[PDB]
RNA sequence: AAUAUAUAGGGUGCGGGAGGGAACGCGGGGAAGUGAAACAUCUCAGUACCCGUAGGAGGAGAAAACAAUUGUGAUUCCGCA
RNA sequence: GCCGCAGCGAAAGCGAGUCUGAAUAGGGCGACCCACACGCGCAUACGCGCGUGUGAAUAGUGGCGUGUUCUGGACCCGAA
RNA sequence: GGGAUGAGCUGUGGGUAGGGGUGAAAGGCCAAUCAAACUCCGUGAUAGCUGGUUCUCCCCGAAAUGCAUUUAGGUGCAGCGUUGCGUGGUUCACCGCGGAGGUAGAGCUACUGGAUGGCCGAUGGGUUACUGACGUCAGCCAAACUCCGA
RNA sequence: UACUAAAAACACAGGUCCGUGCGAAGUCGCAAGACGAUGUAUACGGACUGACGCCUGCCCGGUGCUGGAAGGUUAAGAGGACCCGUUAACCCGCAAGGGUGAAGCGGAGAAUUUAAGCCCCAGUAAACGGCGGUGGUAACUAUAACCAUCCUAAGGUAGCG
RNA sequence: UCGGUACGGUUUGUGUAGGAUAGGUGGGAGACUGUGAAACCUCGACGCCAGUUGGGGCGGAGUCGUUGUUGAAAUACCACUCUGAUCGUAUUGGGCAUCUAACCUCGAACCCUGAAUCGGGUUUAGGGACAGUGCCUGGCGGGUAGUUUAACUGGGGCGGUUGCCUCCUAAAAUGUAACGGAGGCGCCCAAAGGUUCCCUCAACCUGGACGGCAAUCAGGUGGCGAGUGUAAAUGCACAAGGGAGCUUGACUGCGAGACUUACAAGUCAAGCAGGGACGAAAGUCGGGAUUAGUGAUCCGGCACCCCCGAGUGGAAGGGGUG
RNA sequence: CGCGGGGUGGAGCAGCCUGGUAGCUCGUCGGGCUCAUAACCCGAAGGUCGUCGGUUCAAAUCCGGCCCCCGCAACCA
RNA sequence: AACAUGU
């Protein structure tokens, strides 16, 4: 019901962060602006 | 032994609802596979892996090299351009820009450097003889005469539900992908567009999948049934009369096997409550087998179905709907011309006609969303009107299936009574935490069930059914037609399903236009079986074609 | 010989084998107690025991070897690593 | 041959430094006598860095005793 | 005391062997030993268990608690003992000062509950001598009550 | 039960079931070979019952045993698409690197094809086993021949207490 | 006999004008000696997209090309072969049937054999590529073998309990046992997080269409009795309670110093740099008022970094960081 | 005393695991059929889901506290 | 094939 999703970047596709969401309140893939250490700046992050 | 598509241990699941689990099958070219199953079985989730739109969780699923994949979605989208521009974005999409550059290099190269652009038009003019793409003006004019498309100069925002599906089939039958993925193709198509597509998919190079609920289209375009039960896939052969045999047999040998397990729990639960005697021990190796039998007896508890239930309305008078000399159109084309009828009390009326002929416009003058040209529509003081719609315009995607029926409210009105809202939607199959799915993730078979929950809560004694037999399977198609026969008011049905108007009808209103009038209708007093015998005695005795190839190859 | 070519077999004449020995050698079969604070993989251990067969010793031994850009040059055994 | 004589790092490797890190940021681990006048761009005074020493205190390794310890029956006696 | 011409008794010679034999069946019997004989060997089997461990004297001197444990009569580490080298009053006792508390007691019209007798009477019960909510005047109670407080 | 139990315990003649078509089934042995038996279904081995008399009811759901093969599931062998490692050759090139890559040899190997078994389909209780609750009802009380209902594969018959 | 593959014959394709529309490509101006308008034959392959693509009977009288155009393209004839059909040969598998020669016979006779119910050999009567046996492989398997089957406990068994979080017992720091007294947990939230601004609750009383003890309104009174996603305690009206705007700090690289502690763990943290959110700024932000919502090591899985690469270049494998 | 099952209209039972709509057969009540009664046919009434108090928008159901009924263990000396 | 009874 609350699986562990992982957040891949949108430029480099590195998998920088891991967190949990609710599957039934949020059926789509989450999008957050998170810091990417490869790019050195805040990028966008969908899930996988 | 050369293949098209292979699945290796694919397991896609939306948590508790598994769709595949440890499946493996291979698709070879020339195969004609029709995929069946109940509503919500997972049939469109398989084709969204086979088209590369979704990814399986833990498995391998890949197309072979070459032989690209074109999918017909269950709700096919279009663009905001014309019809002739609606067929070039696919089928001609990778090849018209190679002609959009050749008519550019005829003039831009003549004033620039003529040495490096010699091969820039060289590697593109040799891409116009292997495909014969010079006739792109007149290949589109052949593919529209086959499907009987609308005229290709008007926009596509105001089209029929079965005219948008004709221009979406032309986007795929021109591409000719070697793996077709048709998701419910016979929705909204008349008895001509289905009979055409049976002959076109008969002699077709490549693999064809088609998730078709209907009993007669799959007997013509398929010879190898694929099935989806709760997770598994059962490939075999037959012509869909053997699918209802095997699903009836797979539940009679699973149903009584799960009854022998229930008697062995009662014989064993009596042992674990019987108390240890003198200094003997109750064995741990029987407690640990009871709690494995008691765990494998709760995982089999998915056996339920909800019937279609229409609320009854107030008393219906002697005058239901009267139509006197109705004329209706939008342009120089006239749809309805000089129509006179009156809806009976306590009957089922069927509206019959091909696509784009004026059937949804006939309801939208009755419900008060249009305006007649000449003649009037007259209702009466008793009638409360209930109207389901073809377009499903009431349901919005980014809102859950509960709080579209309700609006965050607990108790709703379904016509002079107050039933609870979650008790109302669970009477429409949406049970438990399936009540929090939004409308974008619901299947097509349960947006034809959610639309019946939005609009039948008006509780009226006149229901207008605008294609209700659209995405429903055989179990709930019979549950709908058994809810119209027991309905006390009057029900009006638009449908293309020949074996659905034959079963539940009392009156027929059918289009009978010909070449000199093109806009006349006909009111008949009787069932559908007596209409087809009268149709072949009034107009054209034994007269009421050859397959247009859509291409020169 | 049966039965024909012949063989199995039988007659005669010279050699050889057999069994014992305390340890050591080679080849083959192969435990459990035990240790694992229980136990089955694992250990104990290829130990105890058994079988075949020697010799004054036995086995191995004359590269279808190692090594790493140079090179060592049959085997066994002792010391290191 | 063994122990000592340089450490740090997963390693490549660098080496009184090194690993991490974008960092001449901070930590980890390692190295480094100001008891000493003097000389130095020291100074209200102690110091900072480097010479001159007043010639500061490091140090390991091999044997033989002892106390524990490891592998062997391992302090001795005793099963079913 | 039972059988005593029988499924009898007995002599001489022989056959069956150890997870095997034999059994008119008792786990009976297989050399006074049998829910798996005896002897040699592995072998000085192992035992968180009981027993034992030998000459003297001088200095100091415990513990039976914590935590973990297929652990609870066992054991690892800490606590407490001795001794070697460092550190040198840092330990401890008293006096003065700087500080946190909510026990004892007490209080409750300061809260949450319990509860005694008056008074006023919403309601409930048949127009009312029965019920007496909430309020108020007095007297009280509390390990999981506290405006307080050694 | 030598050595605390001689009995109601074992045996028994009679009974029924099941196995066995003949170097049989069964047993002793790795095997050869032997017993069975110098026998041949009125014979031999197993299981239960235990002279005789009258009798031996109902239940095939469970677990066995016997038969069956339409369907599902299922091993090694056969098969070897597809993807991967190597590099002849080739391209952009700083020719310090990258990219596409034939054949051969490899690594990992899918579809397909395939028996018994198990699921499945029946039979069998002198096969191992199993043979019900609750409430009302008659000329005084009492008891129910009778009835209602729920459940089961079947609801304990003759006899006895 | 039923299939697979390789090879070859015959045959198949018809939206719209048309020679029912060579199917594709390439060659091509000839090809046969001409009546599906024929005589025995005469679509009874398919027969539908119907008449051209056969029942190959014969005839040197009797069709068709190129031109004409009528089209994306043509017209005969033919090698070239895609989709489907059928025929033939070759080479390979699977069924079934027959054979005999391997193998089998405790059926019979004869010899070695003087004495032989053993054994061996010869011959005959049968069985037969099966059976048996080797190797690989599924099944079945208390027939047999090795073992396991926890502890606490007012004896043991039976019943209950085992880790985490809050209170009381607990004797006014911390800690403290019992099968002592009460309760919670194995989550939830994409806002219920971050920030900036703004507001005060419950209960009671008076007036009001439906409307009642209590829905929404209006006014008095009300300093915490409401509220806190969830148990209890400690907190919170300065709000940590209610509402709104923009948002992702539910960050990457760290960490002076502490708490707690046998050890393993647990917990708090000023501040420094990167790149951000909100704010006019000051500043605040490394999830949630706080304390539960979890599992050491080993063995593995995946993503990325390109550290090692068993002669060398790679690779297989290993290593780091999440 | 301890385990663990039960209470639903006059009688018998579902519904309970998986929360929203109280059902089934008989009986009672009114009307038919018949000379009359049973049988049968038609229409109806009847529930505080043992009791109260929490979770929830909502409880017969989920969770605790009580009041009755039924079954089962109580062994080794 | 409906199909019992009348102290
Ligand atoms: N994105 C999603 N997230 C969660 N649940 C989904 C999603 N998509 C589908 N489902 C669930 O899984 C089921 C599968 O839908 P599906 O059966 O593939 O549609 P169709 O009936 O058209 O094949 C649906 O009934 C739906 O309830
Ligand atoms: N708003 C409009 N304006 C113009 N034409 C319309 C509009 N709506 C529908 N039409 C035309 O009316 C024709 C008939 O539609 P109709 O048959 O009523 O739809 P349905 O098939 O759903 O009944 C369609 O061809 C469509 O082009
Ligand atoms: O185009 V329609 O199927 O709604 O007639
Ligand atoms: O593919 V459906 O089961 O939604 O008609
Ligand atoms: Mg949301
Ligand atoms: Mg669908
Ligand atoms: Mg329509
Ligand atoms: Mg000898
Ligand atoms: Mg052992
Ligand atoms: Mg051990
Ligand atoms: Mg031990
Ligand atoms: Mg010699
Ligand atoms: Mg030698
Ligand atoms: Mg090192
Ligand atoms: Mg440093
Ligand atoms: Mg006597
Ligand atoms: Mg006597
Ligand atoms: Mg006598
Ligand atoms: Mg003897
Ligand atoms: Mg004896
Ligand atoms: Mg033994
Ligand atoms: Mg030993
Ligand atoms: Mg000992
Ligand atoms: Mg002393
Ligand atoms: Mg100690
Ligand atoms: Mg003081
Ligand atoms: Mg004080
Ligand atoms: Mg306190
Ligand atoms: Mg007190
Ligand atoms: Mg009080
Ligand atoms: Mg009082
Ligand atoms: Mg107190
Ligand atoms: Mg005796
Ligand atoms: Mg035999
Ligand atoms: Mg017999
Ligand atoms: Mg028997
Ligand atoms: Mg007996
Ligand atoms: Mg007998
Ligand atoms: Mg049966
Ligand atoms: Mg029977
Ligand atoms: Mg009984
Ligand atoms: Mg009786
Ligand atoms: Mg055993
Ligand atoms: Mg052992
Ligand atoms: Mg114990
Ligand atoms: Mg006790
Ligand atoms: Mg304290
Ligand atoms: Mg104290
Ligand atoms: Mg916020
Ligand atoms: Mg707030
Ligand atoms: Mg997180
Ligand atoms: Mg730190
Ligand atoms: Mg900053
Ligand atoms: Mg700003
Ligand atoms: Mg901070
Ligand atoms: Mg919390
Ligand atoms: Mg381990
Ligand atoms: Mg190498
Ligand atoms: Mg690698
Ligand atoms: Mg790091
Ligand atoms: Mg009546
Ligand atoms: Mg006793
Ligand atoms: Zn990035």
CSV table of N, CA, C and O in Angstrom, one decimal, chain B residues 76-89 144 149-168 170-171 391:
chain,number,residue,atom,x,y,z
B,76,UNK,N,-9.0,6.3,-28.5
B,76,UNK,CA,-8.0,6.8,-29.4
B,76,UNK,C,-8.0,8.3,-29.5
B,76,UNK,O,-9.0,8.9,-29.9
B,77,UNK,N,-6.8,8.9,-29.2
B,77,UNK,CA,-6.8,10.4,-29.3
B,77,UNK,C,-6.5,10.8,-30.7
B,77,UNK,O,-6.1,10.0,-31.6
B,78,UNK,N,-6.7,12.1,-31.0
B,78,UNK,CA,-6.5,12.7,-32.3
B,78,UNK,C,-5.8,14.0,-32.1
B,78,UNK,O,-5.3,14.3,-31.0
B,79,UNK,N,-5.7,14.8,-33.1
B,79,UNK,CA,-5.0,16.1,-33.1
B,79,UNK,C,-6.1,17.2,-33.5
B,79,UNK,O,-7.2,16.9,-33.8
B,80,UNK,N,-5.6,18.5,-33.4
B,80,UNK,CA,-6.5,19.6,-33.6
B,80,UNK,C,-6.3,20.2,-35.0
B,80,UNK,O,-6.4,21.4,-35.3
B,81,UNK,N,-6.1,19.3,-36.0
B,81,UNK,CA,-6.0,19.6,-37.4
B,81,UNK,C,-7.1,18.9,-38.2
B,81,UNK,O,-8.1,18.3,-37.6
B,82,UNK,N,-7.1,18.9,-39.5
B,82,UNK,CA,-8.2,18.4,-40.3
B,82,UNK,C,-8.2,16.9,-40.3
B,82,UNK,O,-7.4,16.2,-39.7
B,83,UNK,N,-9.0,16.3,-41.2
B,83,UNK,CA,-9.0,14.9,-41.3
B,83,UNK,C,-7.9,14.4,-42.2
B,83,UNK,O,-7.2,13.4,-41.9
B,84,UNK,N,-7.6,15.1,-43.3
B,84,UNK,CA,-6.5,14.8,-44.2
B,84,UNK,C,-5.2,15.0,-43.5
B,84,UNK,O,-4.2,14.4,-43.7
B,85,UNK,N,-5.2,16.0,-42.5
B,85,UNK,CA,-4.0,16.1,-41.7
B,85,UNK,C,-4.0,15.2,-40.5
B,85,UNK,O,-3.0,15.1,-39.8
B,86,UNK,N,-5.1,14.5,-40.2
B,86,UNK,CA,-5.2,13.6,-39.2
B,86,UNK,C,-4.7,12.2,-39.5
B,86,UNK,O,-4.5,11.4,-38.6
B,87,UNK,N,-4.5,11.9,-40.8
B,87,UNK,CA,-4.0,10.6,-41.3
B,87,UNK,C,-2.6,10.7,-41.7
B,87,UNK,O,-2.0,9.6,-42.1
B,88,UNK,N,-1.9,11.8,-41.7
B,88,UNK,CA,-0.5,12.0,-42.1
B,88,UNK,C,0.4,11.9,-40.9
B,88,UNK,O,1.6,11.8,-41.1
B,89,UNK,N,-0.1,12.1,-39.7
B,89,UNK,CA,0.8,12.1,-38.5
B,89,UNK,C,1.2,10.6,-38.2
B,89,UNK,O,2.2,10.5,-37.4
B,144,UNK,N,-9.4,6.7,-47.5
B,144,UNK,CA,-10.6,7.3,-47.0
B,144,UNK,C,-11.8,6.7,-47.6
B,144,UNK,O,-12.9,6.7,-47.0
B,149,UNK,N,-14.7,7.4,-44.6
B,149,UNK,CA,-14.3,8.5,-43.7
B,149,UNK,C,-15.2,9.7,-43.9
B,149,UNK,O,-15.8,9.9,-45.0
B,150,UNK,N,-15.3,10.7,-43.0
B,150,UNK,CA,-15.9,12.0,-43.3
B,150,UNK,C,-15.1,12.8,-44.3
B,150,UNK,O,-13.9,12.4,-44.5
B,151,UNK,N,-15.7,13.8,-44.9
B,151,UNK,CA,-14.9,14.6,-45.9
B,151,UNK,C,-13.8,15.3,-45.2
B,151,UNK,O,-13.9,15.8,-44.1
B,152,UNK,N,-12.6,15.3,-45.9
B,152,UNK,CA,-11.3,15.6,-45.3
B,152,UNK,C,-11.0,17.1,-45.3
B,152,UNK,O,-9.8,17.4,-45.2
B,153,UNK,N,-12.0,18.0,-45.3
B,153,UNK,CA,-11.7,19.4,-45.3
B,153,UNK,C,-12.3,20.1,-44.0
B,153,UNK,O,-11.9,21.3,-43.8
B,154,UNK,N,-13.1,19.5,-43.3
B,154,UNK,CA,-13.7,20.0,-42.1
B,154,UNK,C,-12.9,19.6,-40.8
B,154,UNK,O,-12.2,18.6,-40.9
B,155,UNK,N,-13.1,20.3,-39.7
B,155,UNK,CA,-12.4,19.9,-38.5
B,155,UNK,C,-12.9,18.6,-37.9
B,155,UNK,O,-13.9,18.0,-38.4
B,156,UNK,N,-12.3,18.1,-36.8
B,156,UNK,CA,-12.6,16.9,-36.2
B,156,UNK,C,-13.1,17.0,-34.8
B,156,UNK,O,-13.2,16.0,-34.1
B,157,UNK,N,-13.4,18.2,-34.3
B,157,UNK,CA,-13.8,18.4,-33.0
B,157,UNK,C,-15.3,18.0,-32.8
B,157,UNK,O,-15.7,17.3,-31.9
B,158,UNK,N,-16.1,18.3,-33.8
B,158,UNK,CA,-17.5,17.9,-33.8
B,158,UNK,C,-17.7,16.8,-34.8
B,158,UNK,O,-18.0,16.9,-36.0
B,159,UNK,N,-17.4,15.6,-34.3
B,159,UNK,CA,-17.6,14.3,-35.0
B,159,UNK,C,-18.4,13.3,-34.2
B,159,UNK,O,-18.5,13.5,-32.9
B,160,UNK,N,-18.9,12.3,-34.8
B,160,UNK,CA,-19.5,11.2,-34.1
B,160,UNK,C,-18.5,10.4,-33.3
B,160,UNK,O,-17.3,10.5,-33.5
B,161,UNK,N,-19.0,9.6,-32.4
B,161,UNK,CA,-18.1,8.7,-31.7
B,161,UNK,C,-17.6,7.6,-32.6
B,161,UNK,O,-16.5,7.0,-32.3
B,162,UNK,N,-18.3,7.2,-33.6
B,162,UNK,CA,-17.9,6.2,-34.6
B,162,UNK,C,-17.3,6.8,-35.8
B,162,UNK,O,-16.9,6.0,-36.7
B,163,UNK,N,-17.2,8.1,-35.9
B,163,UNK,CA,-16.5,8.8,-37.0
B,163,UNK,C,-15.0,9.1,-36.5
B,163,UNK,O,-14.1,9.1,-37.4
B,164,UNK,N,-14.8,9.3,-35.2
B,164,UNK,CA,-13.5,9.4,-34.7
B,164,UNK,C,-12.7,8.1,-34.7
B,164,UNK,O,-11.5,8.1,-34.8
B,165,UNK,N,-13.5,7.0,-34.6
B,165,UNK,CA,-12.8,5.7,-34.6
B,165,UNK,C,-12.5,5.2,-36.0
B,165,UNK,O,-11.6,4.4,-36.2
B,166,UNK,N,-13.1,5.8,-37.1
B,166,UNK,CA,-12.8,5.5,-38.4
B,166,UNK,C,-11.5,6.2,-38.8
B,166,UNK,O,-10.7,5.6,-39.5
B,167,UNK,N,-11.3,7.4,-38.4
B,167,UNK,CA,-10.1,8.1,-38.8
B,167,UNK,C,-8.9,7.7,-37.9
B,167,UNK,O,-7.7,7.9,-38.3
B,168,UNK,N,-9.1,7.0,-36.8
B,168,UNK,CA,-8.1,6.4,-36.0
B,168,UNK,C,-7.6,5.0,-36.5
B,168,UNK,O,-6.5,4.6,-36.3
B,170,UNK,N,-7.5,4.5,-39.8
B,170,UNK,CA,-6.7,4.8,-40.9
B,170,UNK,C,-5.3,5.2,-40.6
B,170,UNK,O,-4.4,5.0,-41.4
B,171,UNK,N,-5.1,5.7,-39.3
B,171,UNK,CA,-3.7,6.0,-38.9
B,171,UNK,C,-2.9,4.7,-38.7
B,171,UNK,O,-1.6,4.8,-38.7
B,391,UNK,N,-20.5,10.1,-25.1
B,391,UNK,CA,-19.1,10.7,-24.9
B,391,UNK,C,-18.5,10.6,-23.5
B,391,UNK,O,-17.3,10.8,-23.4
